[PDB]
């Protein structure tokens, strides 16, 4: 315990690429080039400890439900059991970006190269959890229509693989002027938009909301970009600077809203697949 | 920028005891810890140990437990450290250091001669 | 305690060269080491600190590697003011130790 001592620091004095957040001005780890420390610096308090743990937790109880979901019992009321890779594209999705988000933090003190390599996993993650909602949301919804599913799943995977490749761009170009990530990063979440109406339209409005819950679903879409709306604004770090240097900072709001939106996602999606088994088709 | 002072040279009889200032400005002063270095003429630089204005908690290298004894004033922002029962040995350059985050030095203190003689 | 063996005792160069200062340590120290540079009669400065780090306002030429309980300290393009004693130090454990230190001579 007499190994790798050390304290909290002022914003001021940190390097350049810790410096990622003007209104944290102090409770920061010190850059220390060791995993040991940066994992024991988990059951320790500074800037980070929140965005550790929230993940952390919201990983465990996503891995639970992967696993228990993944052996459910009643693999009878499972209908046909091809269902189950649709449910578990999901999960790797949700857990991998979890798992990524928690370890990013931890090593994020490391070194420059270290954090600029679990970085691009954080991004990669993201993207991942996106391409993992829509699957079982994709087959459900157009659980009746295979053309249609087929067609809006290619896109998503194909928009996908651009925004982790584009992020972790370790096989090509970047740090680029060139803000094409974003591109990419826009088509996921555009991708949704003529989906999601085009059920409404197929299924009529009223059906979908009431049954689809696509409207009762569209908290889901407004918490993540209320999540992205807030961290990119800083608040409530923004309004009250060095208030916020442990505890409800943006970047923990938004870990908090991702596992609880994830969730709503799942808890939505398991709804559609009732609605599925009651109706063949119309 | 960041400035640490120390006091003038001392020139001491054996079994005496000292007192050595660091004067610490530009940083907030319970900020980082304080370390304390010992040269001993044409020899290499000897870690004594540290002090933790904040917590006023202090380790000591075996060599300097009963040697060397560490104290702070906040209001004055400056370090000291006291050596009692001074041999011929501890004919040395003393000098304190300020860590950031962890032990190593970016700011250092001209140091103070401290010269033993019968 | 861990034990710092720096090598060369002593080295000499002409402007414009580069030399090496090894330092070893007695076990592990996790990147956790520092380089200084102290002229004759005054406090040593800081030159890179967590093995690789070049510390603020410190010359390009100087640079850190390795890694467990190898270290080394180059200095590229040598300059007439590089002459003086270099030291390395861990931080990792405690009580933190130096290195025998290494003397530079410019001709």
């Known amino acids: 315990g007499s190994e790798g001592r050390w304290r909290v620091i002022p914003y001021d004095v940190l390097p350049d690429w810790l410096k990622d957040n003007d209104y944290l001005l102090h409770g920061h780890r010190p850059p220390m080039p060791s995993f040991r420390a940066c994992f024991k610096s988990i059951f320790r308090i500074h800037t980070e400890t929140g965005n550790i743990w929230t993940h952390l937790l919201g990983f465990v109880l996503f891995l639970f439900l992967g696993i228990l979901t993944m052996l459910r019992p009643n693999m009878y009321f499972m209908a046909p059991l091809q269902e189950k890779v649709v449910f578990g594209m999901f999960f790797l999705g949700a857990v991998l970006c979890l798992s990524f988000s928690w370890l990013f933090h931890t090593v994020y003190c490391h070194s420059e190269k270290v954090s600029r390599t679990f970085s691009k996993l954080d991004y990669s993650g993201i993207a991942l959890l996106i391409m993992g909602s829509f699957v079982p949301w994709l087959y459900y919804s157009f659980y009746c229509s295979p053309q249609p599913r087929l067609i809006y799943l290619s896109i998503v995977c194909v928009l996908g693989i651009s925004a982790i490749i584009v992020a972790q761009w370790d096989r090509f170009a970047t740090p680029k002027h060139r803000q094409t990530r974003a591109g990419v990063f826009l088509g996921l979440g555009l991708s949704g938009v003529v989906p999601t109406m085009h059920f409404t339209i197929a299924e009529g409005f009223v059906k979908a909301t009431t049954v689809g819950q696509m409207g009762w679903f569209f908290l889901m879409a407004v918490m993540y970009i209320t999540g992205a709306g807030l961290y990119a604004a800083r608040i409530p770090e923004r309004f009250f600077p060095g208030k916020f240097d442990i505890w409800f900072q943006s970047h923990q709001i938004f870990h908090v809203l991702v596992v609880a939106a994830a969730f709503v996602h799942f808890y939505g999606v398991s709804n559609l697949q009732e609605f599925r088994y009651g109706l063949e088709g119309g | 920028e960041v400035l640490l002072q120390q006091s003038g040279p001392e020139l001491v009889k054996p079994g005496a005891s000292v007192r050595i200032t660091c004067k610490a400005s530009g940083y907030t002063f319970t900020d980082f810890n304080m370390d304390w270095v010992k040269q001993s003429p044409g020899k290499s630089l000897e870690w004594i140990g540290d002090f933790n204005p904040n917590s006023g908690g202090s380790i000591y290298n075996q060599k300097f437990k009963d040697k060397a004894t560490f104290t702070v004033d906040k209001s004055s922002s400056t370090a000291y450290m006291e050596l009692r029962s001074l041999t011929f040995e501890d004919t040395a350059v003393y000098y304190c250091a300020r860590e950031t985050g962890t032990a190593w030095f970016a700011y250092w203190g001209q140091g103070t001669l401290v010269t033993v003689s019968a | 305690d861990i034990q710092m063996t720096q090598s060369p005792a002593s080295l000499s160069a002409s402007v414009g060269e580069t030399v090496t200062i090894t330092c070893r340590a007695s076990?592990?120290?996790?990147?956790?080491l520092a380089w200084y540079q102290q002229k004759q009669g005054k406090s040593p400065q800081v030159l890179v600190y967590?093995?690789?780090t070049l510390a603020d306002g410190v010359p390009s030429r100087f640079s850190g590697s390795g890694s467990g309980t190898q270290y080394s300290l180059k200095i590229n393009s040598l300059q007439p003011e590089d002459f003086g004693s270099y030291y390395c130090?861990?931080?990792?454990?405690?009580?933190?130790?130096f290195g025998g230190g290494t003397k530079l001579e410019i001709n």
């Open positions: 130090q861990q931080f990792w454990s405690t009580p933190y130790t």
């Open positions: 076990g592990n120290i996790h990147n956790f």
């Open positions: 967590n093995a690789k």
